[PDB]
Amino acid sequence: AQYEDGKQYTTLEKPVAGAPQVLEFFSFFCPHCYQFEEVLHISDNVKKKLPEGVKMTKYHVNFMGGDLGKDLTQAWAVAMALGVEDKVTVPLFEGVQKTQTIRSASDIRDVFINAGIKGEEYDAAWNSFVVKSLVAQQEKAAADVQLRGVPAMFVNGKYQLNPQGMDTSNMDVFVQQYADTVKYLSEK
C-alpha cells in the first residue's frame, strides 16, 4: 500500500469513541509545535484538504513546562472559551520560545491584554467553571491515549499521524504529505 501502518500513520490499540474528526495536541513549549504553527501552518493546510465543515479540535497538554505548562493549558481553555485562539497563539509561542518573556501566569495574561481581551473579561474567564470544564476536557482527551509526545494528530480517534517517516528536505512537500495523509485517514 502507498499508505501503511508504521509509515505515515499508526492505528490505536484502543480506539476512542466520540472523538472529534480531527484532534490536534500541542504545547507552547514544544519546538516542533512552534514550527507547525509559524512556518508550516499544518492546521490551515489540513483544513484546506478536508471537506467544508469538518470539525478540527486543538488541545494543549500539561506534560511540558511544569507549572507554567499547566497554566498554559488553562490559558488555552480561556482562548477557546473567548474564541481568541488566532489572536494569542503566535504571541504565546514567541513569548515562551523566542523572547522568553513568559515566566508567570501574569505574563500569559499580558499577552491576552495586548491582543485586546479586556482584563476584566480575561479574569472572569480564567476563574470560570466553563473554563474548568474545558481544562478537564483537554486533560481527559490526552489521558485517553496517555499522550506523551506532541505535536500529535488523531483522526476519528483511531489513527495517529506519523510525521517521523516523512521527507523533510522540502517544507512544502512535507506539509502536503501530512495533509494528504490526514485526508486519506479521514476517508478510511
Give, in order, the Cα–Cα distances in Å from 85 to each of 47, 92, 103, 117, 142. Answer: 16, 10, 20, 11, 19
Resolution in Å, one decimal, please.
1.8
Residue of 4, 8, 26 lying closest to 179 (CA atoms):
8
Question: What CA–CA distance (Å, rounded) separates 134 from 84?
Answer: 15
Strand partners, 154: 23, 160
Cis amide linkage into residue 151, ω under 30° from 0: yes
**Which backbone phi and psi does 9 adopt, to 5 degrees?**
-155, 170
Grid cell digits, residue 48: 484546506
Task: Give CA–CA dist 73/142, Å, rounded.
Answer: 12
How many C-beta neighbours within 10 Å does residue 2 have? Answer: 6
Helices H, strands E: what count in the chain? 8, 5
Helix (H) or strand (E) holding 87: helix 85-93
Experimentally determined by:
X-ray
Cα-based angle 162, 64, 58 (whole degrees, multiple of 5): 55
